[PDB]
Amino acid sequence: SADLRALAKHLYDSYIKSFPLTKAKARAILTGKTTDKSPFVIYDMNSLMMGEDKIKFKHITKEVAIRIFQGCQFRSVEAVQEITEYAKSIPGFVNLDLNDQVTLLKYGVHEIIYTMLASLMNKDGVLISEGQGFMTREFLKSLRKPFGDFMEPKFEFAVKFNALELDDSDLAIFIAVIILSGDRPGLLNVKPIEDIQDNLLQALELQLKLNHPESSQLFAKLLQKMTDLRQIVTEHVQLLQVIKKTEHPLLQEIYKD
C-alpha cells in the first residue's frame, strides 16, 4: 500500500471535480493572497440589500433572518448534490445496497456540509455566494432569536477544526470516511460499508503521516473531531425544528430534507 496513496489520489481528484470552491481557493480569498477580487462584504442590513441587488442571488424568492436562512437552505441543497456525486466515486460505494447508499447519504450530508463549511470560515465570518461575498460573524449572531445562534456552533467548530490545518487532499479522505459510517440507522448490510471505511481510514492515516510529517497525533485528533461534528448536528436538529415556529408548500417540499 501503494494503494492508500492511489486511493488518496483518486479521492483528491474526485473531490476537485465534485466541489467547485476548494479550501485552497477559499483560503486564498479569505487571507487575500490573491486579489484578484475582494469579496463583497455583508456586515449589516444595508450591505445585505445592496449585495442582493448586485450579485442577484438565485434563491431570492421578506425578512432578513428568513432570507439568510433560505439562502442557507438553497446552498445546502446544492451541496447535497455535489456530495452525492462525490460519494458515487468512492470505490465500492455504488456496489452497496441502494437502500444503504440512500441511508448513508441521508445521515452523512449534514456532517459533511459542516466539514466543508469550516473551509469557508475564519473566526470573523464566512464566504458566501461561490466566494463572491463574505458575511461577517457578528452580523449573523446579531440576527433575532432564534436565528441568532443558528450559525454560531458552526463558527466554534470551524475555528477549532481549522486549527488542524488540513488541506483538500486530507479533507477528501476525511469526507469519504464520514460517508461510510456503519452506525447509520436502518442499514441492511454493514459489513461492506465498514470494510470500505477501514480501507479509507488506513488511507487517511497514511495520507496524514505523509502530508503532515511533523505531527503524529493528528489522526486521533481528526477522528475525535468527527464526534464534535455529530454533536454539532445533534444540537442543530434541536434548534432546527424548533423553527417550525415559522409558516409555500412546494418550496417546503424542495427543502423537506
Helix, strand, coil share (%) of the chain residues, nearest 5: 65, 5, 30
**What does 234 interact with, of a second copy, ligand 3JX, none (CB < 5 to 8 A by kind)?**
a second copy
DSSP for 59-85?
Answer: T----HHHHHHHHHHHHHHHHHHHHHH
Instruction: State yes or no: residue 251 binds ligand 3JX (CB under 6 A).
Output: yes
89 has binding-site annotation: no
Instruction: State yes or no: residue 252 binds ligand 3JX (CB under 6 A).
Output: no
Pairing of strands 133-136, 125-128: antiparallel
The CA-atom distances, in angstroms, between 67 and each of 10, 31, 72, 196 are 38, 28, 9, 40
Phi and psi at 235, nearest 5°, equal -65, -35
Residues forming contacts to a second copy in the complex (CB under 8 A) are 177, 181-183, 194, 197-199, 201-202, 204-205, 214, 216-217, 219-221, 223-224, 226-228, 230-231, 234
139 has binding-site annotation: no
Tell me which H or E stretch contains 123: none
76 has binding-site annotation: yes
Instruction: Write down the least CB distance from residue 182 to ligand 3JX, Å.
Output: 22
- The window from 67-75, 84-92, 94-102, 218-226 that contacts ligand 3JX (CB under 6 A) reads 67-75
Instruction: Write down the least CB distance from residue 129 to ligand 3JX, Å.
Output: 4
Q: How many beta carbons lie within 10 A of that of residue 136, not counting itself? A: 16
Segment 230-249, which members bind ligand 3JX (CB under 6 A)? Answer: 236, 240
- For the annotated binding site for rosiglitazone, the residues are 73-76, 110, 236, 255
What are the binding residues?
73-76, 110, 236, 255
